[PDB]
Amino acid sequence: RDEEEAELELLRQFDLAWQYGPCTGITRLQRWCRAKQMGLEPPPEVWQVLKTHPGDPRFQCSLWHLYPL
Amino acid sequence: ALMEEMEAEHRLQEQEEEELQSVLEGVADAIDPRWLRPTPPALDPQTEPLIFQQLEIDHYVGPAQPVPGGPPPSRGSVPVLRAFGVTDEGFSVCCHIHGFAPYFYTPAPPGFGPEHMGDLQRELNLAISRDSRGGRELTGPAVLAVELCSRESMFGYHGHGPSPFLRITVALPRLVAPARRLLEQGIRVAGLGTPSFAPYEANVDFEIRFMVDTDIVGCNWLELPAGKYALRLKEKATQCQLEADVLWSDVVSHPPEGPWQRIAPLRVLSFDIECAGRKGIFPEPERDPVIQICSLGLRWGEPEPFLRLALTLRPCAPILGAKVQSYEKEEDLLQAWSTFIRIMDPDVITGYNIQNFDLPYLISRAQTLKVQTFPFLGRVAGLCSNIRDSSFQSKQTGRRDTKVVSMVGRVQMDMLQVLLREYKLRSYTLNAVSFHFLGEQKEDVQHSIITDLQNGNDQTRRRLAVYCLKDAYLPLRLLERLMVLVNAVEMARVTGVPLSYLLSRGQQVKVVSQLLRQAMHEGLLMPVVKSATVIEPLKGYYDVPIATLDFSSLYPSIMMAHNLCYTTLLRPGTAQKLGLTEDQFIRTPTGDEFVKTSVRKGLLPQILENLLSARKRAKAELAKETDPLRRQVLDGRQLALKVSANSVYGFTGAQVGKLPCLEISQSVTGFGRQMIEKTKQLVESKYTVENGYSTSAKVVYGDTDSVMCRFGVSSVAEAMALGREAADWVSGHFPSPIRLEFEKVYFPYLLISKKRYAGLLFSSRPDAHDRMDCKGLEAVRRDNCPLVANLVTASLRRLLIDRDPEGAVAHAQDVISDLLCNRIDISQLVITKELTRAASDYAGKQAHVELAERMRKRDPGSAPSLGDRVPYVIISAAKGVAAYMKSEDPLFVLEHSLPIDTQYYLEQQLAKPLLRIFEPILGEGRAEAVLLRGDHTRCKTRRNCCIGCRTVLSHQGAVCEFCQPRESELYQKEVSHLNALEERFSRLWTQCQRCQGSLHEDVICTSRDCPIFYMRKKVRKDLEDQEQLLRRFGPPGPEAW
Amino acid sequence: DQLYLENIDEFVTDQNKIVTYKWLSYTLGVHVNQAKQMLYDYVERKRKENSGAQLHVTYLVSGSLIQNGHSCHKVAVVREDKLEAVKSKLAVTASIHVYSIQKAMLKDSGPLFNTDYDILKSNLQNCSKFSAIQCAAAVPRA
Amino acid sequence: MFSEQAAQRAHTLLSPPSANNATFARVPVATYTNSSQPFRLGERSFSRQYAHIYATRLIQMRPFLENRAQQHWGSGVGVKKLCELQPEEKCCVVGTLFKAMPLQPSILREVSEEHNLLPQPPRSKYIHPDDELVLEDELQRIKLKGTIDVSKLVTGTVLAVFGSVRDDGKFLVEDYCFADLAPQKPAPPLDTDRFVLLVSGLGLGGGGGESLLGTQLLVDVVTGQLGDEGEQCSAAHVSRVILAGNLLSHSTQSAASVEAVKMLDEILLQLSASVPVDVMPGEFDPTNYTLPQQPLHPCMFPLATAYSTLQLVTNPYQATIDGVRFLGTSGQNVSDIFRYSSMEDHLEILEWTLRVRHISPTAPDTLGCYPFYKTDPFIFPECPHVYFCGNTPSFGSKIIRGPEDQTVLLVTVPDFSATQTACLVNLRSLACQPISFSGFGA
Ligand code: SF4
Ligand SMILES: [Zn+2]
């Protein structure tokens, strides 16, 4: 549970980072790829975590996914 | 029966407040230079006086002090008065006044002589000592003095002149209540037997008694003369900069008339908090911490706040235009805020709903975290703030159960209480109030989103701080816009009560104070006692101008006219015995006899005459002043004068009160009926075609202070001329100040029923209108959907401005047809209800309770807690299901596309108002058939299927072979619809960004009362569905080359 | 070559049709320039021998002109009385030829458009078969 | 020019019939390449907010404007973000502009309890003397004041302002600069004259007799039906035809479009048999109301689509013809800017949009746009040789040069339904010549 909790916290911090742009309506992998395309050099740990937990909506979905914005 | 229980509850509250109010055992105990109050100069109390404006006055019990040239340096339990206020330069001033004790009066029993007086005193001194009742708390003597004076009762007309009375002065305030009661039981006095004494003015507060005796009105200027006081240099019991001790016979009061009408530079602090509670649970003080506290301080008079501050937990990003501090641990945050409140030392504290949710939560959290020094907020050192519970209930403003926080030395003005007690609105939430008063709809944020932002990075916390600062600043904008403080100061200056009493006690205290002030001149006591023919209208649509005649304060003018007052009343069967002549008194229709001014002038006529003179002077001086501040002050003054003059009768006529009398109310109502009848007959008599006039005028509407007449002319100028001439002619026969004046003219007049009329307003220009006036709000209840109000407003505008009843009928038909075809948006049909009472508090099950329970069973996170407002709409369900079971959350309906019960809306929201409006126009009964009984009132009307033939398709094309040649025609029918959605989409989301106040940042507004919130989601879903539908046709072309 | 002359004579006199150039080109199935030359020959030869001939021949004038400081190009249809002024106004004259012949004088240009549009709609499959510009890239696809 | 080349051949139609007749051939297009890929979208999704299309835009302009600063105020000024500023310190700040106006329409007012509120009919420019300008980067907002023109600029502009923060919180501005033109690759030269015809706003379905006669004359001239031998020879060099938006009439949008579409199909059948035709959808054409408007569906054109010369393209028609790059729109951005700015001349507006390096700067604040998240395709990657926009009341043409030796031609094509004028663009000397048709009436 500790590893999963730490990984969830890391992904949430990545979602709440302000220097990559908004984080509503796009999956985290798309946001990370867009950040890399512009040369901002997003962290590789987030990409590895996303790639090691495929299909689970707790990871791919953005932070404000559940709420009806 | 609410009035009697309210009086009992207020009496119990006063009795509780009196007990243990003696703060003698209650005492148990990195700075910016901008905060400090200006430094006091070198002051010598032997040459210069002290001048300051006092805000609040209260009393505490303690040992006596050596005031120079005054009381001896004793330690007896004598009352001490305190006055907190502001000097000219801004120094807070706290003043101590000594040597004042409460007193009351009793009538002289037969055969009483001076020699018994002292003996009586002894017996009374024996009473409280012998009587264990009173808490068994006594030190020395119980009665300080017994004196004999000459007074006459104000109730009735005896005509025997002044009579002896006994004035009894006791040491302590709280001892007034017990001894008075004993005086009703009779006291054994040797020689005199066991006589009884009727109480007189035994239920008057000590502060009010001092204000009446020394002639000091609330929020007025005081001067302590040089050499008459003493200045404390050590052991200041309070936190103020100047403490002065002065006897009560030297404090000079300056009435606020002329150069002494200015307002000192008060300090107003608006404060707010933000907390991070658990998911789906209303915040609680035990476990949920407080993260942000925002404050704005403003010197009164300046147009901008002079201090912004935002204290947040954890490090925060800097803000331009304010100051941000970061505290690691919450205890330091709370203690720092307490130190800030002590050092800044504001004199008015405000916010929004701070009396019920902010201060109790902060104090409970401080107690839980074991921060001992937070509660010390009052100006008195060592006074722990105490939370109490109380309630205020009325059949019009509802029931409120609120906590009250005691802060001695500061005045709290919670805007929610002021709005509740001075306005009537559909919704009292902050967002709705802001939208209604300033036109700006503010952003709403869920608590889970705030909790998520708390764990974010520095910029997110900065955004939260900015939101909290804006929310705390809005009440200051409301206070400046409505000028609440100026009106409050004007009321406190006119009615002679301190500023705080305007928000804790009823209407009777003001009239009691004014009556005592007026009666003290003539030496008249106040004994304590225990508790129409409206003109028939003609509903319809008058397409000719209608003239309006108004009575200027009919009831007070009638009271002034015929000498109606407490002292002018005659006991039945007394005039013959007293030898009065038949031309001295008048006989009211209800059978009461009142003497004219030739014998005695009553208190009420003099008070009302003084009020009218003051209003006339204020109106005269308004036209010449150019300074906006003095214009606001004079406007407040005239408004307060008018309100007090109106409320005099409201006091007098109350069945339950401190001095009820139904004879005056009956006489006033009879005179009103008689005068209205006389006006109607005279108006009918004058304007006749016999006297050469074109048309016969007649009165069509009449009630109290409103007569609406028809003169048969079609030109507005002639209507106004005839109205003014009629006003003068009628006022030339009504004796005494009672007058009737022209008010306005409505050309298109729609008279629904009594107290229900509408028209177009013509006030100044006979050719150009001003607005659309309409009484009888009708669509005012919060449970009525906005659709009803919109339809009523549209119908009224079409009937009045467009003057096309057919157009209004067509619009109503179109609206009904759209409603019956599921075309009207859901946002218009939302009904919101508050969980005011607990689920077990309802006699029967209701819709919102079941909806809240089901939402909680679905997901606790989004489930509203008790006390919040839940929205719902009536969904279509099977017959036999309970009525409360048809409610559902609008978002759930939007997600599942559930059917809406249209019949309930049709026959329970639009039938009654439309029928009431259109009965005078199209006639009773026929209008029902025209509106909701007819063809328009009915308007009768997974695999891929062809849109044309509606058949199952073997393939996945748009149409089958049978509908092939028409395929093109279908395409133009589809894309043209999609376009009509896309534009709307582009006009919705961008709008929210303007509402948010930023472009690049995300949108987190989830307000449930903004129709855009529902509309944007519906538009998004419709766009997705339409794109999926249009993909069935062939693709427009390649996209990979 | 009096056959088409008599055909046009019967078209104008008896049937009272509005004879443009496209209409005659489609009816007789000839090249457009040859149709214009036929119309010009008929117009010129009619007046020598006939003292009446209430024609309302309308010409087409095109060329260059100066408008708002620009070397604009003008193409217009004008009647037989305004020809001299339009010739004078245009600096350079490029094309001048007979455009329309009809016996009934026309207040406006509506009938010409209606006639040309009707005959165009009647023969869609061969819209540009008789034009003076023929392209090889535009081959219909079945 | 057109007249000079037309007058070479002698007049032959004012003579008796002749045995022979001239017959020319259409000039084949040597090269062509459609490059509207960024403006052509496949599966469309609308589950995002507009904020994305702003943020990326800023991050796509910051590396440009900074360079421009070095060419105006020297290298002694360093770009400082808003949160790093200090009072009374001269600095340069790069960001977007927001123009607060009182007359900007709001859905909330039109939908709230006010409803009518004395409804305001649509009108001209919504500019007001009380408009304010707020500079904004990703983090903070700040009001502007100083030597800046409030009315001229519009929302969505990205600029670098030099100035300082005053004690009241506002920003005093001394000078502002724009991103200017993009790098350009010079086009290869030609050998013989070629022409491209630009038409816009046919307005079918209006019923106007003069407009219909003008359309008929244009169709006959382009296809070589009408004109003497010299005119036909000179018009045989027109290698393309572009019809840019507003094809139908105002009242054909709800309908009665079933007749206007048939008329348009017949006209396109007439044109496609003699010259390639490129159709760009407009505001009143049957398509969606985003700014990138997908091509008209071929099912609506049963007859014209039978050929292969006809082509339907996206709204911004970025193409390459004979090594010369063309970029055009339908005129919505120009109209929106003209309605939200104090400028009058449409050609000036077009040049201004060229000098901000953005096709539609007001989008998406007042003009509907698809909510992109990956990239914003409106920014020019390479400066086009020819820039044109249709549906303007006055025909215009102008040649401009950038600071780095550019050469751009701006053409404002007149609304053909009103003025009955089209444009000929040369491809050798890059000259623009108007050509108008008219019919008599009395
Ligand atoms: S985002 Fe829209 S719905 Fe939400 S508060 Fe702002 S204006 Fe109202
Ligand atoms: Zn079918």
Author numbering:
A (entry chain D): 39 to 107
B (entry chain A): 39 to 67, 74 to 575, 584 to 993, 1008 to 1107
C (entry chain C): 3 to 144
D (entry chain B): 1 to 254, 270 to 457
Sentences reproduced from the published study:
The cryo-EM structure of human Pol δ was determined at an overall resolution of 3.65 Å. The structure revealed a fan-shaped architecture (∼160 × 100 × 80 Å) comprising the catalytic module (p125 residues 1–993) and the regulatory module, which includes the carboxyl-terminal domain (CTD) of p125 (residues 1007–1107) and the three regulatory subunits (p66, p50, and p12). The p125-CTD plays a critical role in maintaining the integrity of the complex, forming extensive interactions with the catalytic module and the regulatory subunits. The p125-CTD coordinates Zn2+ by CysA cluster (residues 1012, 1015, 1026, and 1029) and 4Fe–4S cluster by CysB cluster (residues 1058, 1061, 1071, and 1076). 4Fe–4S clusters provide redox potential for several enzymatic reactions; however, the 4Fe–4S cluster in Pol δ is located 20 and 45 Å away from its exonuclease and polymerase catalytic centers, respectively, rendering it unlikely to be involved in any catalytic activity of Pol δ. Notably, the cryo-EM density of the linker region containing the PCNA-interacting peptide (PIP-box) in the p125 subunit was disordered, suggesting flexibility prior to binding PCNA. A striking feature observed in the apo-form human Pol δ was the presence of an acidic α-helix at the N terminus of p125 (residues 39–58). This α-helix occupies the single-stranded DNA-binding cavity of the polymerase domain of Pol δ (left). Most residues forming the α-helix are acidic, allowing electrostatic interactions with the positively charged DNA-binding cavity. Local resolution of the α-helix is relatively low suggesting its weak binding to the DNA-binding cavity of the polymerase domain.
